[PDB]
Design a protein around this ligand. Sequence first.
Ligand SMILES: Nc1nc2c(ncn2[C@@H]2O[C@H](COP(=O)(O)OP(=O)(O)OP(=O)(O)O)[C@@H](O)[C@H]2O)c(=O)[nH]1
Ligand SMILES: Nc1nc2c(ncn2[C@@H]2O[C@H](COP(=O)(O)OP(=O)(O)OP(=O)(O)O)[C@@H](O)[C@H]2O)c(=O)[nH]1
Ligand SMILES: Nc1nc2c(ncn2[C@@H]2O[C@H](COP(=O)(O)OP(=O)(O)O)[C@@H](O)[C@H]2O)c(=O)[nH]1
Ligand SMILES: Nc1nc2c(ncn2[C@@H]2O[C@H](COP(=O)(O)OP(=O)(O)O)[C@@H](O)[C@H]2O)c(=O)[nH]1
Ligand SMILES: [Mg+2]
Ligand SMILES: [Mg+2]
Lengths: 428, 428, 426, 426
Amino acid sequence: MRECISIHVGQAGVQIGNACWELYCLEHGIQPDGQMPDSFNTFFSETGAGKHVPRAVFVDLEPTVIDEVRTGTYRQLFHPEQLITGKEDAANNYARGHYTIGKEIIDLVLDRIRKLADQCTGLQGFLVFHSFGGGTGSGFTSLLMERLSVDYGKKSKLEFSIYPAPQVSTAVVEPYNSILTTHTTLEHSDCAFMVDNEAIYDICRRNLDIERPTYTNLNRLISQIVSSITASLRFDGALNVDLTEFQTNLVPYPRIHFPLATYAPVISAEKAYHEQLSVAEITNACFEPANQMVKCDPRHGKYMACCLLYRGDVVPKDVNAAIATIKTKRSIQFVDWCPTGFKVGINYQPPTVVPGGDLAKVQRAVCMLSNTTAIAEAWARLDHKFDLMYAKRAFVHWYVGEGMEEGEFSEAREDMAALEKDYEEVGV
Amino acid sequence: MRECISIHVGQAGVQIGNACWELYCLEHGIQPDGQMPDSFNTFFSETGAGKHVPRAVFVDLEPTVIDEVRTGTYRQLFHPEQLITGKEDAANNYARGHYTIGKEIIDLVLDRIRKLADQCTGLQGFLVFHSFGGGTGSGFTSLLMERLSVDYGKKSKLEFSIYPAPQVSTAVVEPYNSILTTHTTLEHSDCAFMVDNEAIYDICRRNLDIERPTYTNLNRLISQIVSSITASLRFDGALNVDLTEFQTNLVPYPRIHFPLATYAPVISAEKAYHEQLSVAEITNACFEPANQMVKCDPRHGKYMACCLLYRGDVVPKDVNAAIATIKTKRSIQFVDWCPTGFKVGINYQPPTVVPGGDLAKVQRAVCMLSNTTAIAEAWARLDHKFDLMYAKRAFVHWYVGEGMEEGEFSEAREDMAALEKDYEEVGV
Amino acid sequence: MREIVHIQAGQCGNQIGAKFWEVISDEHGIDPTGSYHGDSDLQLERINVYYNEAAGNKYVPRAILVDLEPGTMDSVRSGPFGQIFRPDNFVFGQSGAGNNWAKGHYTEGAELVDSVLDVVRKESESCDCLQGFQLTHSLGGGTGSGMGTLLISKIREEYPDRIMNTFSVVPSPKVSDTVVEPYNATLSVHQLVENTDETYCIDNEALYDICFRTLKLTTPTYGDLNHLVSATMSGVTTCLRFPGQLNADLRKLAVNMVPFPRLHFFMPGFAPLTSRGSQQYRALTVPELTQQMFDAKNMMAACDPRHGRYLTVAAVFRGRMSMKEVDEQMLNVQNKNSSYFVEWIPNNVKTAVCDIPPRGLKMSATFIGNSTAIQELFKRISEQFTAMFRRKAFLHWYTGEGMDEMEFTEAESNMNDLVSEYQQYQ
Amino acid sequence: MREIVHIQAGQCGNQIGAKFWEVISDEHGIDPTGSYHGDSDLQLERINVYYNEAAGNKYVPRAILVDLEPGTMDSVRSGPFGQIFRPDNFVFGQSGAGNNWAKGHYTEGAELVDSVLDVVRKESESCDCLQGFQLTHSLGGGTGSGMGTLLISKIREEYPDRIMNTFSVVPSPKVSDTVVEPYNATLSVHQLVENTDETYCIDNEALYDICFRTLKLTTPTYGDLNHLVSATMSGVTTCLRFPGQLNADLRKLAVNMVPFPRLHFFMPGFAPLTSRGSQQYRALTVPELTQQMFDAKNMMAACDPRHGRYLTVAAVFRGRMSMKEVDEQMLNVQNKNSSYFVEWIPNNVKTAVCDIPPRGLKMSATFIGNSTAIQELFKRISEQFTAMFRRKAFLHWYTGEGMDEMEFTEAESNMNDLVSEYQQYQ
Ligand SMILES: Nc1nc2c(ncn2[C@@H]2O[C@H](COP(=O)(O)OP(=O)(O)OP(=O)(O)O)[C@@H](O)[C@H]2O)c(=O)[nH]1
Ligand SMILES: Nc1nc2c(ncn2[C@@H]2O[C@H](COP(=O)(O)OP(=O)(O)OP(=O)(O)O)[C@@H](O)[C@H]2O)c(=O)[nH]1
Ligand SMILES: Nc1nc2c(ncn2[C@@H]2O[C@H](COP(=O)(O)OP(=O)(O)O)[C@@H](O)[C@H]2O)c(=O)[nH]1
Ligand SMILES: Nc1nc2c(ncn2[C@@H]2O[C@H](COP(=O)(O)OP(=O)(O)O)[C@@H](O)[C@H]2O)c(=O)[nH]1
Ligand SMILES: [Mg+2]
Ligand SMILES: [Mg+2]
């Protein structure tokens, strides 16, 4: 009836998608072959007899990562034409992604998206998974975003983004890419849910007792959050919230569209047994900074909108009580222009857990989407990083080679300065 | 009751006929010996007891290609006297086909045709299969066409033509031949269905995932279209369209008689499983340029008449809906003098598939016959090609040797210029 | 005592016709062999209106089947009820008309028409007192349109004092099934305005809508569409075939509903129509029926009756009913929707009641509306035709068959005149 | 003789509505299939007030279900009693409103509203004498609030002389379930003050409190909360559906309780309410009921009635009771708590008694208070709205849907005016 299209861009996007789709399959009892021996229809189309196909598009500019999907366990799950690969990667270069390499494959991907949309009766919108730092995740994604807005426009667009960490980082040009994609995507995205790999690592180590978390673990964790977000569409609940809701409830001004995700409880079977995981207790967990999925200081910021999505054996009254308690707590401060800061979703289905996963089976969970002036701090460091490198024109030539102009960088800088100013001003 | 005579001229014609007849046999359960252990009677005559003979004539000016038919799997299927061969070929020379070599065998073939017609109670007309580029396919065919008109006249004549591609081509003199046959056949043909080998190759590669398509594959693909066209005569359907219909519904002015064929869906067993091949989806496929069987740009032209022949598990309402949707789509434009641009046929029999073929078994198919001002572009390039070569009188002497006069070339040029002018003027 | 002669022309005509015949057989308790296996004596009392008794207690439709192609005939003969028809009443050509009115009317049809006329004459001469003729066909093809039209005229010449009825499936607004549809339709209309006493305007689009929205039919078939038409036809002749409290036959209806000779194009409707699921959640009362009747969603012509005014409405009710209720409700509707009824014909509604309901139901209704909104349909065709003629498109296909341009112009003129007339009364 | 038309808008509206319907069915002895399996003839005598008889001794709610999303509808249809509803009375969109009043009222809702209006019109026209309309919805969302409000206005235009009743679940003081709640509520209120005859102010917070403190419910469910609301609704219409000693219907209550047109926001209450344990340790007498009624802990609005004054109170009693006792007790309470009753309306209490008690109980009571303390609620919303507007927060979500700032200002003005009016009388 009402359907959701998932787009997975670049390595990070693709890998996250792999997790998410697996989780979905597990949850709806769909086998890796597409067979199952009816709300799942929002995510899976049905073909002929006893086969189900994800409403998904996977894109990468190199073949290697998607080649694993097409040779792996879930090779039969996806339709070949929805797994799109080029030949040469974007090489951590926004320009290659947005112009030189991306312009060769974008039309094809758009056609696929259009075809997907033709099979929808009540398209809710798009979920796009991508990194900010990679050349395809940035450059290609911005290109795709802009295109989507023209073709569709009014339909809601949601981004899941691996935000770069303060200390830990892989790429050298990552700041440049992050700024540039932010500039170009800002006017085209309705809401973007950031997460941070550092934070997820720490949580894994501290809360799950995992010595050595791998990217797979992180992906799995991400998948849970995604499931929480989309459970309101994929199941029936007491009080529920669709994809069109979030943008209205979490974005007070058009440019300030960066809410952050937090999941609770994330605990092993060791510490699960020795704990009464009540609604109040889980809720409280979410408002303490060590459990949050972006490295950043909320204690140094103020909350503007908070959305709480509960799942499983949960009753309204206790949730309400918990919210009241949170409100009472002086150390959790909300901006003065927002007396009503909570949006609450409650769904009946407990979180399903992947066999051989790190997480224990729980009666209840919560996914909080929170919008905070603390994001300004994060932006600032990134800006500073950008500024240093540009002061020496370090790496700038590469970008120019691929058709980008120096003036674009300046523009991007300016826009980020504006954004940070806006963030500051909302606070006061 | 109502019968159809097939004529297969030259190599290309003969090979296409081989495919088509095989397909027919498969569809009606006729063995390669003519036996079957009653609508098929429109295509097969019945002799004595438990034998069926195609209402077909095969003609070539050299023995080699037909010698394969007379020694092959279906040697017993055809009556020896309906497989007609000369000794020397037309050597890619229209003049040899039309005059020098053709005038030796034409009378014989006409007699055979007359004999075939004597066994018909309600002759609908003729289907002629031939290339534009070969000396026999051109020169002989034009001769035969003219003759047919005199002997019969009022009966409908339909051509299936391998139109030469823009880039890819085999013969060097191909443009000369194409122009000349067009000139001479124009006033004698009621409707001619063009196809292009380049386009079929691309479709095979792109849609069927075939690395290396052979002529056989192309022939098989062509056969399907032919079956679609004639299924209305060979089976009983919901809403059906005979051979006499097309000429009325697709030809708005006598000279503008070149509609183009498109088939859908053409897909392997890989991509068949992971797709709900609905009526709307197949119909939509037909109006996108990459799936069409002539290399040419409809987006740069306008549609004048469109005929859609559906086959298999298809219901009127959905077809109607699809047509409405197509009409709504701004990128598919029809000329302003034609508010009703659709002719629709619906037949109950799903497409039958040849064992060991490239195509998957489908519940539904569609064959579109579309008439478009985009054919003008195709004509133009050909004209240009002709013009260059004639500027130097390149190859002209050969034609002269076989009795052709230079003035004939001029006349042909003039007629093509007229045709292109007409095409342009219809558009405005 | 009174007799009806049935004619079926072309593909559409034959296919609807077969369904109609089946329906009639069911109603009168006659099986596919021609033998009566009914129960009620009312079923047989007026069986002679549609059936000739061919001895050995067997009944045969007074039906003539005509086509320029034999395929349709073959399909019919092989169908369920194909065996009830008289073999000599199938009159088929060999050529076909190729969706060309000219061929149907002047060429192929001309060759075959004499035979059909002869058959018709024979049929008439056996029957004691012919009320008249009902022809089923399309206007958009070549056979039903060109040959059917020709047949009408010839019939009229012989039998100028008998009633001439047509059930014509007309070109829809949204989607066209032929390219030359406007030409074929227009020419047919030209002949129809002058030579028929009434024409029931059936539109496939409307039928589809009904199937989808009212009948809740995921995948309607052409057969299903035809069924509705058949039902309507049955409703229209019910007073000739069964008793009643107030009876109206074809002539009575015509006189009530046609105030000026040219204005005889009806929008038919049928009620009730419910899904399998929604059968439980409504009561079978007259009010519901009335509501269904007076509703744009239930009209079998692709025209909104609220875009014009009703000149006359004939309502034909079947089942055991209170006449008072009917009278009240017809009054009430008129009072309510005064603006949709022409003000200079007081009491715009004619009512008839037949005691015998159709099988499986307790109560049914058939609606015939003569609405000035039908002009819209005519206008749309007319515009299209004019456009086509502006570029002389496809004209050589018709002129090649001996037709002259002048005829086309004449047809156009008539069409325009009709719409003007409709407008004037509106 | 008299008829009520029920409308349900949005998630909350639908969910309460279903419960209400279930309750009604139980009361009248109708099962989930639509068939009557009751015993007392009193149960069926006035069944037509809420149910249409759809033949085959089956009954169907005069209920219209509206939402911009189909999920809720699906949930309802699949529920226990989902099958009693008329399938054609479910009117759903595909998009949703995303907790945006603008979408509900001007955009998505606008597209869908016509259909719902048509359905309503049809319902009205079948019913002989409509008393009026009851709408269940929230003010805090987009559908129930924006589309529901739109529906009200449209209904009023058609039927200006019929009674317009709403059961509105309003934003609580402690915790908000949406961020834009104050906007949605405010706009809804603006329309409600001008277009409804009465509004029952239900607060979820109050319900929760009741469940916890009075019902002793460790884990209340939204269903349980809804049940209370349903019961209240049932209590409110009891005199239309059963006999009594002194009878008051919707109009009588309205005239008694609304002294000035704008002051029609009631605090409803229901009595008795006891735990499983505390059932034994109290006697079922009128005094106890009275006590329960006149108590802040038993009010379904999050407002302390002792912080204002009662303009009017309507008490509706069910069961076999001594009228004298009732009269005495109502007098006595007034005497006792003179300070909480406005001094310029002598005899502030209206009493009605219905002989038929609800099932499982011997005796019940429903309270409707028109208290000037409701102003507090309005004030709290108003302040919030003003604050939000000061920073233009979230405004682009509404202006993007075509709304202008001026409308917001107007709404604010109305809100303030209402509170001023309330204060004046206090
Ligand atoms: N959470 C998570 N992050 C990832 C994963 N893979 C890569 N990343 C992060 O993504 C960023 C690197 O971007 P990639 O996605 O590898 O690059 P890409 O999108 O393929 O872009 P190019 O290869 O430059 O075309 C770094 O911040 C990585 O830490 C993954 O599986 N999970
Ligand atoms: N589709 C298809 N095209 C063919 C086939 N054989 C030849 N052609 C095309 O036909 C054209 C060459 O003409 P032919 O039919 O071989 O020549 P011909 O008709 O025998 O004439 P002559 O040999 O000159 O007497 C070229 O455009 C070929 O690509 C075939 O089996 N299938
Ligand atoms: N209602 C109905 N319409 C049909 C049927 N078959 C064809 N038509 C319509 O008839 C028109 C085509 O004309 P047709 O009668 O086939 O051509 P003809 O044989 O030359 O008269 C189109 O408008 C079709 O939609 C049918 O079985 N039922
Ligand atoms: N009493 C009650 N309130 C509800 C229920 N469901 C949602 N609500 C309330 O309705 C408000 C949310 O509005 P909702 O009706 O879901 O949004 P809409 O669908 O856009 O109108 C919140 O104040 C919820 O507390 C329910 O089942 N019962
Ligand atoms: Mg990569
Ligand atoms: Mg050759």
